[PDB]
DNA sequence: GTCGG
DNA sequence: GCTGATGCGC
DNA sequence: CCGACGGCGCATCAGC
């Protein structure tokens, strides 16, 4: 793509901050820049172009200078030398191992991957099922699949509950042509602001999920969130389909739009929606919007009848779903 | 790392 | 058990 | 020119 060099540069320069450095500050800086370059429709042509775009500053300048100049960049050149930091790196690519655990790893001489399965003992339930499906977890999911998955999902929760409302989110929501996973929102009308009238409800839809082994194994479960794994059935003498990330989010069912525009994204998305609604004075989260006080203190919840709702109190124009991708 | 209080 | 902090993740 | 940057669920640990 256009800038699509200058993007990656940056990009892996956030990473390395997350999860080498440990500096998510500058992971969030050259997250936010990549993000503004990535919509720009011209191509750069010198660091000083960029700099007039919004969270690109001197140092990002300098390095895009360079890569232009050059193709390459010294300070990525020298991080991809480091073992120490590209064992880090990699170590995080493990779900449930985040930047601290990589290091701790790393710094006990786990260094690879044949390193994690002679050390079982020291991993955690959430990072050996990381570990187990490691594979299939780098892995995209095509919409195809998405699709015959969706159609599950749907028709479970149907069997238990027909007033049951799912929502399949994420880049599927905004037209993608393949997903990291699958994000599923769900609603109840025994599940409001107002209150818990059924115990279990998102309980319910897990274990029928699990009775009809489509959900294969549990990362985290509460009373509002599941974090798993799934897969599809596969025919006889056909490979297996790889095994996939599966999140659920119970959202209370008159917080609907809320919900469905934070569980839609982008992340960088809804970290630029909630930062601009911060300067018209606003606070989002996934349950509402609310304005802020003079103290700091948000205000009651603003009424919301669509996503558009939303955009229109920040005096955004409505974006699609597909246009809220990066 | 960037931008603003 | 709790509150608060941290780690991991959406 | 130093200090703030979306917002939150779940799991675990520290210090009660
Ligand atoms: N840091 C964050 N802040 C706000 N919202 C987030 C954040 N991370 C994730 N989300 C929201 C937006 C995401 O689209 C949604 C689902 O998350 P996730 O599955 O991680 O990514 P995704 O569906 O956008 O892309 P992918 O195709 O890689 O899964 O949750
Ligand atoms: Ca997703
Ligand atoms: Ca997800
Ligand atoms: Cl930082
Ligand atoms: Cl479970
Ligand atoms: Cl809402
Ligand atoms: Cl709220
Ligand atoms: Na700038
Ligand atoms: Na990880
Ligand atoms: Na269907
Ligand atoms: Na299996």
Not at 241 to 249: A, E, K, L
Request: positive net charge; hydrophobic residues 30%.
């Amino acid at each position: 793509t256009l800038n699509g060099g200058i993007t990656d540069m940056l990009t892996e320069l956030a990473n390395f901050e997350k999860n080498v450095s440990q500096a998510i500050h500058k992971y969030n800086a050259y997250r936010k820049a990549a993000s503004v370059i990535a919509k720009y429709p011209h191509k750069i042509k010198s660091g000083a172009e960029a700099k007039k775009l919004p969270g690109v500053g001197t140092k990002i300048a300098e390095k895009i200078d360079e890569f232009l100049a050059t193709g390459k960049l010294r300070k990525l050149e020298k991080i991809r030398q480091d073992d120490t930091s590209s064992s880090i790196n990699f170590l995080t690519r493990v779900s449930g191992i985040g930047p601290s655990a990589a290091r701790k790893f790393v710094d006990e001489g786990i260094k690879t991957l044949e390193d994690l399965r002679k050390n079982e003992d020291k991993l955690n339930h959430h990072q050996r099922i990381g570990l187990k499906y490691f594979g299939d977890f780098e892995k995209r999911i095509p919409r195809e699949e998405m699709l015959q998955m969706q159609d599950i999902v749907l028709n479970e929760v149907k069997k238990v509950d027909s007033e049951y409302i799912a929502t399949v989110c994420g880049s599927f929501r905004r037209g993608a042509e393949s997903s990291g996973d699958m994000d599923v929102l769900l609603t109840h009308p025994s599940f409001t602001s107002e209150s818990t009238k059924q115990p279990k409800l998102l309980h319910q839809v897990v274990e029928q999920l699990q009775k009809v082994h489509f959900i294969t194994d549990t990362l985290s479960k509460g009373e509002t969130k599941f974090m798993g794994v799934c897969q599809l059935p596969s025919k006889n003498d056909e490979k297996e389909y790889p095994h996939r990330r599966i999140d659920i989010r119970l959202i209370p069912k008159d917080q609907y739009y809320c919900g469905v525009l934070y569980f839609t994204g982008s992340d960088i998305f809804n970290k630029n929606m909630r930062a601009h609604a911060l300067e018209k004075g606003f606070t989002i989260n996934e349950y509402t919007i609310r304005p802020l006080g003079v103290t700091g203190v948000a205000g009651e919840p603003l009424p919301v009848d669509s996503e558009k709702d939303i955009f229109d109190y920040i005096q955004w124009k409505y974006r699609e779903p597909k246009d809220r991708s990066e």
